[PDB]
Amino acid sequence: VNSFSGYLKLTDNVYIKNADIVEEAKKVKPTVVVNAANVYLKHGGGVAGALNKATNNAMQVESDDYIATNGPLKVGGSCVLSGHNLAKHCLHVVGPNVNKGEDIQLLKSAYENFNQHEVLLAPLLSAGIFGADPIHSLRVCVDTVRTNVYLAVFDKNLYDKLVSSFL
Numbered sequence: 312v313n314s315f316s317g318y319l320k321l322t323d324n325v326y327i328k329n330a331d332i333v334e335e336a337k338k339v340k341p342t343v344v345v346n347a348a349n350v351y352l353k354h355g356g357g358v359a360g361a362l363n364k365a366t367n368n369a370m371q372v373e374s375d376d377y378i379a380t381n382g383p384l385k386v387g388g389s390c391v392l393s394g395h396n397l398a399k400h401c402l403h404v405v406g407p408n409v410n411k412g413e414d415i416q417l418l419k420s421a422y423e424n425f426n427q428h429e430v431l432l433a434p435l436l437s438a439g440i441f442g443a444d445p446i447h448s449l450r451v452c453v454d455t456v457r458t459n460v461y462l463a464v465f466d467k468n469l470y471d472k473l474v475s476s477f478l
């Protein structure tokens with residue numbers, strides 16, 4: 312039993328809700344919140360900009376130190392940093408950004424990072440301003456993640472479309 316509330320069950324391990332991931336994190340304080348990151352951990356907009364804003368820019372400050380020490384992430388890769396006021400940990404995961412010309416086959420690799428954590432509050436990878444097809448991303452999530460994932464989908468129209476089209 313966990314404290315996630317109001318989620319529609321999709322499969323054995325994947326759940327979905329129409330909510331802002333920031334608000335789900337503020338309410339649940341999950342062990343792991345996933346950020347839809349880029350390789351530079353520049354949290355400018357979308358999920359990343361919203362999460363970072365909710366930390367009063369502390370996520371960005373921590374991220375800049377991480378990059379100064381370690382260099383950029385790989386597309387498809389991840390790192391674990393603090394969850395600040397929102398969660399115990401933040402798993403920064405880089406899905407491909409097709410608006411930047413990055414490669415969509417890397418979406419499965421990106422979701423594989425979730426399997427290192429038993430339970431996660433996560434956004435739909437490569438959705439929104441990353442420019443990928445959200446229906447495809449949900450399919451990759453369900454077919455790749457084996458641990459328990461709670462997907463928070465901010466956009467109501469998208470949530471409705473995702474549920475109604477799920478196979």
Ligand SMILES: OC[C@H]1C[C@@H](O)CN1c1ncnc2[nH]ccc12
Nearest residue numbers: 331332358361438439463465466
């Ligand atoms: O709607 C699903 C995706 C794609 C784009 O619409 C934004 N987005 C989010 N999902 C979950 N939490 C979020 N907080 C802020 C934005 C956001």
Ligand SMILES: [Cl-]
Nearest residue numbers: 357358439440
């Ligand atoms: Cl977005």
